[PDB]
């Protein structure tokens, strides 16, 4: 504003903020159990085992 | 930063005994990673033992 005497004024304001977050988790598991048993009382010296 | 490490471990063992040497070790060779077990070789091993 200026009248009989001059007066000067000036102001400025600016602010900026940016936040960020990122997370990712991955997991994988697997289990398999296979057992085979064979008992033969056949009566041959070789063929029973064969 | 980019670091990567990988480790592997393997242990294989086998044994056999009995019978004549020829048929027994024929069974041995055809069994070890052969993936195709035969009947005639096992009959030979049978007569051998």
Residues of B in contact with A46 (CB under 8 A): 43, 45-49
**Residue B45 burial (CB count, 10 A):** 24
Residues A15 and B21: their CA atoms lie apart, in Å, by: 90
- Torsion over CA of B22, B28, B30 and B36, rounded to 10 degrees? 130
Q: Name the residue among B45, B44, B8, B46 with its Cα closest to residue A45.
A: B46
Q: How was this structure determined?
A: cryo-EM
Q: Which two tokens stand for residue B31?
A: 């069994």
Rounded to the nearest angstrom, the minimum Cα separation between B29 and chain A is 17
Chain B residue closest to A48 (CA)?
B46
Q: B8: which 2 tokens?
A: 């592997």
Q: Give kind and range of the element (H or E) at residue B43.
A: helix B40-48
Cα-based distances in Å from B19 to A14, A28, B3: 94, 48, 55
Q: Any idea how long chain A is? A: 50
Q: Are B48 and B20 in contact (CB under 8 A)?
A: yes
On chain B, the residues whose CB falls within 8 A of the CB of A49 are 46, 49
As to burial, measured by CB atoms within 10 angstroms (0-12 exposed, 13-18 middle, 19+ buried), residue B4 is exposed
Reference B18, options B28, B33, B8; nearest CA is: B28
- Distance between CA atoms of B20 and B47, rounded to whole angstroms? 9
Chain B residues touching residue A36 (CB < 8 angstroms): none
In terms of CA atoms, which chain A residue is nearest residue B47? A46
* Burial call A23-50: b when 16+ CB within 10 Å, e when fewer: eeeeeeeeeeeeeeeeeeeeeeeeeeeb
Query: Is A24 an 8 Å CB contact of chain B?
Result: no
């Amino acid at each position: 504003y200026e009248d009989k005497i001059n007066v000067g004024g000036g102001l400025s304001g600016d602010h900026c903020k940016k936040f960020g977050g990122g997370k990712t988790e991955r997991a994988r598991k697997a289990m398999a159990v296979e057992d085979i048993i064979s008992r033969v009382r056949g009566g041959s010296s070789g063929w029973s085992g064969g | 930063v980019n670091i990567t490490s990988e480790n592997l471990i393997d242990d294989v063992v086998s044994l056999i005994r009995g019978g004549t040497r020829k048929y027994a070790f024929e069974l041995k060779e055809k069994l070890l990673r052969g993936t195709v077990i035969d009947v005639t070789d096992f009959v030979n091993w049978a007569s051998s033992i």
